[PDB]
Amino acid sequence: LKIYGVYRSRASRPLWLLAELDLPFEHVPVIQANRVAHPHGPEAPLNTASAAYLAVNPLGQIPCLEEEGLILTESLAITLHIARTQGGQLGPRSEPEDALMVSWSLFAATAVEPPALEIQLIQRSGGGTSPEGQAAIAIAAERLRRPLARLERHFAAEDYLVGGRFTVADLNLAETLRYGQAHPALLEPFPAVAAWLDRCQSRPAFRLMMERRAAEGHHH
């Protein structure tokens, strides 16, 4: 089992999951090409533009999973696969539970990640220091209103997405939401959602993943 991608990327999803498990694996750090001066260079560290990596993931993105006879792209698919084959109770007990996890993951990828990622970039870019950046964050937050309200309703009676227990479905949704976490007002209207995200991030494996992510070298 090999996982390609640095902690400071969507590879954080499968890395967090593996941290939840007592499973050895090979971590192949691959950096985003834009963070490397001469990515094509014969002496450049393995990155998303490296020919050697494109032979693994033709799309040139991280993360990517490679096992004996299987190459899998898409962070949320990678985690679901790992959870169902190596994750024990973090994986689905039945096909309907698996379907629910796939559904929550697609919900996370299509309804939550885009607007949340937008908030993250406005913030990191420094754009949030202008009235325009602030207005833009509010517009992105409005795109998240329906998804967040639906989640608030769900967490009114449940502590987790599926089966009354933390599963890869929570991990997957929590990671997409992490992008918009830096905006204080985002979860203010949604206490139950904030409590759930706090519940997921208080886990030892998350803290460990985040500490490893912090210790990772930065590249611009």
Ligand X SMILES: N[C@@H](CCC(=O)N[C@@H](CS)C(=O)NCC(=O)O)C(=O)O
Which residue ranges make up the annotated binding site for glutathione?
Answer: 10, 48, 62, 75, 146
What, of a copy of itself, ligand X, none, does residue 23 touch, CB below 5 to 8 Å by kind?
Answer: none
Tell me if 58 contacts a copy of itself by CB under 8 A. Answer: yes
Select 55 or 202, whichever has its Cβ closest to ligand X.
55
Among 18, 53, 65, 74, binds ligand X (CB under 6 A): 74
What, of ligand X, a copy of itself, none, does residue 9 touch, CB below 5 to 8 Å by kind?
Answer: ligand X
Q: Nearest 5°: phi and psi at 171?
A: -60, -45
Q: Please report, for residues 26, 96, 126, 185, 193, the alpha-carbon distance to residue 159 in angstroms, rounded to integers and kept in the order given.
A: 33, 19, 35, 22, 9
CA distance 220 to 205: 27
| Cα-to-chain-centroid distance, residue 63 | 10
Tell me if 84 contacts a copy of itself by CB under 8 A. Answer: yes
- Torsion angle (degrees, nearest 10) of CA 49, 55, 60, 64: -120
CA distance 61 to 58: 8
| Footprint of a copy of itself (CB under 8 A) | 34-37, 58-60, 69-70, 72-74, 76-78, 80-81, 84-85, 95-96, 99-100, 102-103, 105-107, 109-111, 113-115, 117-118, 121-122, 124-136, 138-140, 142-143, 146-147, 150, 153-154
